[PDB]
From a paper:
Present models of the tertiary and quaternary structures of NS1 indicate that the protein possesses two globular domains, each capable of forming independent homodimeric interactions.
While the helix-helix interface appears to be the only dimeric form of NS1 ED consistently observed in all crystal structures, it remains possible that other dimeric states (such as the strand-strand dimer) contribute to dimerization in solution. Although the helix-helix dimer interface is shared by all structures of the NS1 ED, and may have some biological role in that RNA-binding activity of NS1 is affected by its disruption, we noted that in all helix-helix structures the arrangement of the two ED monomers differs markedly relative to one another.
Residue numbers in the entry:
A (entry chain E), B (entry chain B): 87 to 202
Amino acid sequence: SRYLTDMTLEEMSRDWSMLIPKQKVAGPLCIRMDQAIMDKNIILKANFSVIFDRLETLILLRAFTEEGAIVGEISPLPSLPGHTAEDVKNAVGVLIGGLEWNDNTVRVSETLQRFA
Amino acid sequence: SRYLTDMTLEEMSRDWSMLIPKQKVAGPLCIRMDQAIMDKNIILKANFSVIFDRLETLILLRAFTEEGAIVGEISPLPSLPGHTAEDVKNAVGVLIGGLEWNDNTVRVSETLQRFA
């Protein structure tokens, strides 16, 4: 019983577009990032469901340019196979990877690093 | 002039082609990899110049499918700025990253891991 956020409802409800789309499936999680993006300073805001006072399941992470532009996202698979912080942190390191590839400078919301 | 190798002259002298080309510049080093490649088992063979009995400079690393197919390569920049094992290991972790992205299963020549 709960849920936690870095992002605004807006930030999440919003829909977005990749010029150079890149999907992937990391076990129970779908990573996406626009490869067209370069030399920008990015951040990963994310929002986990919180159960009995602990970061449980990640609901949604997305990547933001300084300009509030969405450039990447990790969203649970529709079949919602139960996923672990591993599947996550893994998936994360990855998206970062893919992003860093374009000289992009990627930070992470305090929320996240916490985990674990 | 002394020097060490995993690859055959053939393997190195050879020229190759990327369906989905991906370049990058990692300080003094140019990484390349064909993003088109997927679900294959890859290995990184590399060849360092050896000075007074230590792995000094990397001359060339390339990535190989099981089928002896070249799919990625790290080659020093033409201007040959003196590079360090860092610039390297960095660059390496990267290429691996980029490769792993396509479900590719990437190994590394014993030579390499050695370093450092």
